[PDB]
Amino acid sequence: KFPRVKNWEVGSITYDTLSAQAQQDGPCTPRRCLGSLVFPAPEQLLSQARDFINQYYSSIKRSGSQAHEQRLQEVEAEVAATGTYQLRESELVFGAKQAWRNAPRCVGRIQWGKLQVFDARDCRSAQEMFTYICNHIKYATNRGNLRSAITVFPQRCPGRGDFRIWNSQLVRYAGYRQQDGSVRGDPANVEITELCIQHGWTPGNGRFDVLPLLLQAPDEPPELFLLPPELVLEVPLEHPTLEWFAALGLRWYALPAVSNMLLEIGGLEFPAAPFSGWYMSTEIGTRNLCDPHRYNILEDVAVCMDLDTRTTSSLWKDKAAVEINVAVLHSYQLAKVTIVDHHAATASFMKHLENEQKARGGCPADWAWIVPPISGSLTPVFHQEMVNYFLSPAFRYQPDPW
Amino acid sequence: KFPRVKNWEVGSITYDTLSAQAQQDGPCTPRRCLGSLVFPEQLLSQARDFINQYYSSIKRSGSQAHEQRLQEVEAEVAATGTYQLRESELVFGAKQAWRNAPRCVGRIQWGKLQVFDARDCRSAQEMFTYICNHIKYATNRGNLRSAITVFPQRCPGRGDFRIWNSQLVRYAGYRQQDGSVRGDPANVEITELCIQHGWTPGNGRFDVLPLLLQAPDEPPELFLLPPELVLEVPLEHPTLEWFAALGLRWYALPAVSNMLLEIGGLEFPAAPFSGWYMSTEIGTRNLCDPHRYNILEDVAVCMDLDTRTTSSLWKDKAAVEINVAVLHSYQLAKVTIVDHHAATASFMKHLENEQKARGGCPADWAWIVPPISGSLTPVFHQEMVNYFLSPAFRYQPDPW
Ligand code: HEM
Ligand code: HEM
Ligand SMILES: Cc1cc(N)nc(COc2cc(CCN3CCC(F)CC3)cc(F)c2F)c1
Ligand SMILES: Cc1cc(N)nc(COc2cc(CCN3CCC(F)CC3)cc(F)c2F)c1
Ligand SMILES: C[C@H](O)[C@H](O)[C@H]1CNc2nc(N)[nH]c(=O)c2N1
Ligand SMILES: C[C@H](O)[C@H](O)[C@H]1CNc2nc(N)[nH]c(=O)c2N1
Ligand SMILES: [Ca+2]
Ligand SMILES: [Ca+2]
Numbered sequence: 001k002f003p004r005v006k007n008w009e010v011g012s013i014t015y016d017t018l019s020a021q022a023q024q025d026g027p028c029t030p031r032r033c034l035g036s037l038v039f040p041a042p043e044q045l046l047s048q049a050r051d052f053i054n055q056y057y058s059s060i061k062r063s064g065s066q067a068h069e070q071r072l073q074e075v076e077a078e079v080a081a082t083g084t085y086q087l088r089e090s091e092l093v094f095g096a097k098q099a100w101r102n103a104p105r106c107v108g109r110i111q112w113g114k115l116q117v118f119d120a121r122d123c124r125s126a127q128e129m130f131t132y133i134c135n136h137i138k139y140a141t142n143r144g145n146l147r148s149a150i151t152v153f154p155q156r157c158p159g160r161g162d163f164r165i166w167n168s169q170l171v172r173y174a175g176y177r178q179q180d181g182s183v184r185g186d187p188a189n190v191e192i193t194e195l196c197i198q199h200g201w202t203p204g205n206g207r208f209d210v211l212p213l214l215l216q217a218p219d220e221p222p223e224l225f226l227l228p229p230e231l232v233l234e235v236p237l238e239h240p241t242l243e244w245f246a247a248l249g250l251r252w253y254a255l256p257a258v259s260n261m262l263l264e265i266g267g268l269e270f271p272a273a274p275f276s277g278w279y280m281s282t283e284i285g286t287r288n289l290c291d292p293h294r295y296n297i298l299e300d301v302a303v304c305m306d307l308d309t310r311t312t313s314s315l316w317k318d319k320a321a322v323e324i325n326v327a328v329l330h331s332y333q334l335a336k337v338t339i340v341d342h343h344a345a346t347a348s349f350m351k352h353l354e355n356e357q358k359a360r361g362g363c364p365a366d367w368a369w370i371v372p373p374i375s376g377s378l379t380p381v382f383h384q385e386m387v388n389y390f391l392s393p394a395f396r397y398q399p400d401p402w
Numbered sequence: 403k404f405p406r407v408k409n410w411e412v413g414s415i416t417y418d419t420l421s422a423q424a425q426q427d428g429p430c431t432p433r434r435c436l437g438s439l440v441f442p443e444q445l446l447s448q449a450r451d452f453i454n455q456y457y458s459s460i461k462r463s464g465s466q467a468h469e470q471r472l473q474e475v476e477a478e479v480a481a482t483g484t485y486q487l488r489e490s491e492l493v494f495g496a497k498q499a500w501r502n503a504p505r506c507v508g509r510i511q512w513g514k515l516q517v518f519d520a521r522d523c524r525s526a527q528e529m530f531t532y533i534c535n536h537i538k539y540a541t542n543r544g545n546l547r548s549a550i551t552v553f554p555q556r557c558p559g560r561g562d563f564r565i566w567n568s569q570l571v572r573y574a575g576y577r578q579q580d581g582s583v584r585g586d587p588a589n590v591e592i593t594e595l596c597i598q599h600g601w602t603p604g605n606g607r608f609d610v611l612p613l614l615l616q617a618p619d620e621p622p623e624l625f626l627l628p629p630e631l632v633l634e635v636p637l638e639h640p641t642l643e644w645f646a647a648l649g650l651r652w653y654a655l656p657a658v659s660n661m662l663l664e665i666g667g668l669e670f671p672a673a674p675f676s677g678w679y680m681s682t683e684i685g686t687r688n689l690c691d692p693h694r695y696n697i698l699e700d701v702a703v704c705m706d707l708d709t710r711t712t713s714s715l716w717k718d719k720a721a722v723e724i725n726v727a728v729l730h731s732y733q734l735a736k737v738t739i740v741d742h743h744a745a746t747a748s749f750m751k752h753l754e755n756e757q758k759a760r761g762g763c764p765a766d767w768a769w770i771v772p773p774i775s776g777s778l779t780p781v782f783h784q785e786m787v788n789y790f791l792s793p794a795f796r797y798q799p800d801p802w
């Protein structure tokens with residue numbers, strides 16, 4: 001049939017009929033589920049192009065119209081002559097919003113229809129690429145009143161290299177491999193930090209050194225660009241009632257801007273299409289600051305809190321982590337930088353699921369990524385069964401360009 | 403063909419070679435993953451493969467004893483349509499079924515399991531006696547001890563032994579003409595069955611239900627558990643003195659009673675098992691789930707938390723203190739309990755042991771990761787592979 005999906009908080013039941021439209025296959029089989037893994041041609045292009053055009057003309061309630069038939073005929077002829085085609089500008093906007101809407105691991109998809117799409121398909125150099133990125137960062141940051149945005153650089157085409165942003169995000173803190181084997185700064189960024197240095201970047205020695213951008217124009221080594229400090233909004237972390245917390249000297253940046261995914265629309269591939277929204281506080285407070293392999297501050301906050309860290313049964317870890325998340329939310333609200341906490345984010349996502357159930361009969365969702373990393377069952381998505389599948393247009397992971 | 407499995411905290415890689423022996427099929431397809439759903443004579447080949455497991459396990463594979471049990475079960479199935487496990491095979495099967503349970507974080511303990519053979523049971527009155535012995539043994543005055551009691555297997559033409567209750571110890575749930583529930587909302591159905599089959603309903607929030615035991619082809623029989631048999635822990639907080647006044651309690655012994663145990667093609671629809679609690683089961687799920695006791699906002703109000711904005715994390719702060727209360731109250735009463743940090747660390751060790759022992763371990767990430775402080779535990783960062791091995795515990799249709 002169709003997967004029967006239950007919400008255990010309410011007792012309610014839906015069927016995900018949308019999953020039957022899934023194209024690209026996932027990693028699970030009847031023998032074994034791999035849902036927990038992080039990373040698990042004209043006729044095929046036309047089939048994807050056709051389906052996307054159908055999606056576009058459905059969205060504007062013009063299916064089967066003359067304009068619909070003619071755009072299909074047009075895409076066919078371009079593919080027949082060139083082996084590829086070009087999106088109309090309207091199709092690109094629609095495609096990027098659909099890719100977000102289709103992203104199973106994104107809890108912020110209530111917002112998918114409110115996405116500023118910057119068309120950078122006529123970009124020609126790394127320098128111009130940097131200008132686009134700075135305007136993106138300026139637009140999206142908006143002095144702390146964050147606006148979702150994506151900039152789409154030229155599509156992959158035969159006979160020419162890709163545009164690529166080497167950095168995984170537009171704003172990342174350096175992670176300097178200390179000589180012991182430890183890291184100063186963000187350990188997630190040791191590799192890209194070493195690539196920046198190797199490409200001419202004079203490194204700092206702080207824990208919150210903003211990395212430069214390594215931008216790759218087609219058939220070119222990456223070129224290094226320093227973000228103007230006034231462009232990179234940061235929030236000093238303090239706690240509303242733990243006054244020593246500010247002395248920890250913690251900071252995070254305003255703008256989460258993923259820059260290393262591939263955007264796929266109607267068979268066309270955009271290997272450089274950085275996108276940004278605003279943070280959910282648990283990404284900063286729990287993951288970025290408390291992961292053992294990230295900044296790993298949990299035990300130092302707990303010790304400062306004078307918690308009994310000798311036994312796990314005191315739940316000092318849970319107490320310290322809550323306060324770190326309180327500090328993150330308080331600090332962003334204090335600095336007037338958009339942020340959403342995980343209760344509000346997951347409530348909005350439940351509303352997204354209900355909208356998508358009526359709109360499309362389902363919503364691809366990756367439960368382990370939608371459930372926040374603290375307080376899981378205190379949010380409503382915990383009790384919501386979810387079906388994970390791949391729709392297109394899509395954001396996709398891609399090999400690192402080096 | 404062998405799934406690569408990464409630990410993101412350490413960077414370590416293993417390959418799950420055990421998944422290739424997945425006996426049955428799970429709910430997932432290449433088209434769509436359904437891992438988050440709670441409920442997704444040829445009997446000879448099952449029986450054969452289990453016997454091979456058993457003798458491989460005692461390093462007697464292909465031996466004379468192996469070849470003899472083989473032909474024995476063959477002849478038994480030919481004579482009777484079913485066959486009987488040797489007592490030791492039953493012990494090995496019960497332990498394996500636990501060991502193969504992907505959603506159980508407690509499997510570091512899988513080798514210590516007291517198996518109680520009740521296959522000689524008939525009538526519900528005998529069920530009740532086997533069950534009180536289990537309960538007394540497993541409770542052990544708060545020094546909790548894992549156990550299973552195996553009742554007679556399903557066989558053709560004969561009815562089934564069924565414990566109608568989902569656990570041996572369940573709190574009642576009652577409704578009123580404001581729609582709400584007093585007691586445990588999860589037990590409204592079993593509670594009205596007990597009423598309909600005789601039981602006199604209390605009016606409390608922690609009224610222990612009676613047992614509805616059913617022998618083959620008779621109706622289920624009410625049995626009341628003796629009060630001195632069901633060890634409960636009044637919940638108090640080490641520093642929030644008003645917490646005691648909320649009158650919260652839970653019971654010592656988690657004893658699942660409604661799952662089907664499957665061994666070498668045989669099926670036991672009544673084989674209750676028990677361990678001890680992980681504290682987040684009580685403090686987070688049973689007390690704080692919106693459809694269970696749902697006490698979170700009650701506690702937050704008593705903590706003078708700001709419940710009118712989500713961003714004060716009042717739900718998170720209240721939940722931690724409820725779990726602290728649970729841990730403190732079980733320790734004070736000297737009832738075995740384990741916190742989610744210690745439990746997930748032990749499961750990591752179990753994964754390492756199982757990787758060496760059989761090249762993998764079926765694990766359902768969504769159930770291994772605790773419902774609070776997820777990424778603060780090491781299992782959050784451990785990729786896992788979920789598949790079905792046999793012997794196994796399975797869900798089964800309710801007996802009505
Ligand atoms: C506006 C507020 C937004 C919020 C609160 C939000 C939140 C999140 C969170 C918490 C995750 C999990 C990431 C992780 O833990 O690694 C995620 C993933 C993701 N987000 Fe959203 N996001 C927002 C905007 C966007 C936008 C504007 C796009 C694209 C246009 C987008 C696309 C994605 C994708 C593709 C992923 C999945 C990456 C992966 O598969 O690992 N998000 N988001
Ligand atoms: C001894 C300490 C034990 C601990 C701390 C423990 C912990 C847990 C937890 C937290 C779950 C998830 C259940 C839920 O949240 O709904 C679970 C499931 C399970 N346990 Fe264990 N358990 C223990 C003993 C046992 C024993 C002795 C058996 C059988 C011999 C067993 C068999 C199972 C099975 C079959 C499940 C899956 C049930 C489901 O799908 O919800 N467990 N356990
Ligand atoms: C727009 C937006 C808003 C918001 N609030 N949050 C996000 C976070 O989006 C992503 C986060 C990550 C984390 C890196 N993750 C670590 C382990 C492995 F290295 C795999 C990569 C990866 C990724 F691909 C993402 F898309 C995005
Ligand atoms: C021995 C032991 C120790 C321990 N510490 N914990 C457990 C908990 O084992 C189980 C928990 C549940 C959750 C119930 N829930 C009801 C609503 C729906 F029907 C889905 C299931 C079901 C179940 F079948 C279990 F086995 C067992
Ligand atoms: C092993 C596991 O899949 C991995 O650590 C995942 C789990 N869920 C997650 N969920 C989110 N939102 N982000 C993550 O990085 C992860 N990590
Ligand atoms: C929808 C979701 O799969 C369901 O609520 C699961 C999630 N993980 C769980 N994990 C545990 N330990 N116990 C549960 O009951 C659940 N419920
Ligand atoms: Ca009324
Ligand atoms: Ca108040």
Ligand SMILES: [Cl-]
Pocket residue numbers: 256283288
């Ligand atoms: Cl991040």
Ligand SMILES: [Cl-]
Pocket residue numbers: 656683688
């Ligand atoms: Cl329980």
Ligand SMILES: [Gd]
Pocket residue numbers: 241242243
């Ligand atoms: Gd203070």
Ligand SMILES: [Zn+2]
Pocket residue numbers: 028032033034035430434435436437
């Ligand atoms: Zn799956």
